């Protein structure tokens, strides 16, 4: 839980740092997430929407996408994934 | 010509603190003028052009704009004024 606790003042911390830079946008990439096409930004950009999150492929199911939380926050697959 | 030299010296040490800060527009104000009509700002804004000025008045004919240079940037009355 001192993780979690960590990571969450680290990201807070970040988000406080781009609002008094006057900044449109902050795009968090991590650790692994090998953003290949050099378009991503425009394109994600280009469609004004509030919060839009491209969906990364992988070599299995997963994916950084939910479709549907049951009562406490847990993937619950609805057919339309 | 030494005072000239603390002024260019102070806005041009202000156009650049006005752009690493990443902000739309500069409003230049002396502190010598009455800024009445409580909306100035939006009219300025809403006018989307590169370089604009309102109009002040005065007492006489002197207002804050010219109409002509002539060969040495120096005063010219052109019967549009």
């Given at each position: ?5 960590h ?6 911390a970040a988000?406080?740092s781009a609002?008094d ?6 795009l ?11 378009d991503?930004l425009?394109?994600l950009?280009?469609?004004n929407?509030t919060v839009?999150?491209?969906?990364l492929?992988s070599?299995?199911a997963?994916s950084?996408?939910?479709?549907g939380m049951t009562?406490?926050?847990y993937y619950?697959?609805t057919?339309?994934?």
């Amino acid at each position: 839980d001192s993780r979690y606790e960590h990571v969450m003042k680290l990201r807070q911390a970040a988000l406080k740092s781009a609002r008094d830079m006057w900044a449109d946008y902050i795009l968090f990439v991590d650790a692994d997430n090998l953003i290949l096409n050099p378009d991503t930004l425009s394109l994600l950009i280009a469609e004004n929407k509030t919060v839009v999150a491209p969906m990364l492929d992988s070599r299995a199911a997963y994916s950084n996408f939910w479709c549907g939380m049951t009562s406490q926050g847990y993937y619950k697959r609805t057919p339309a994934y």
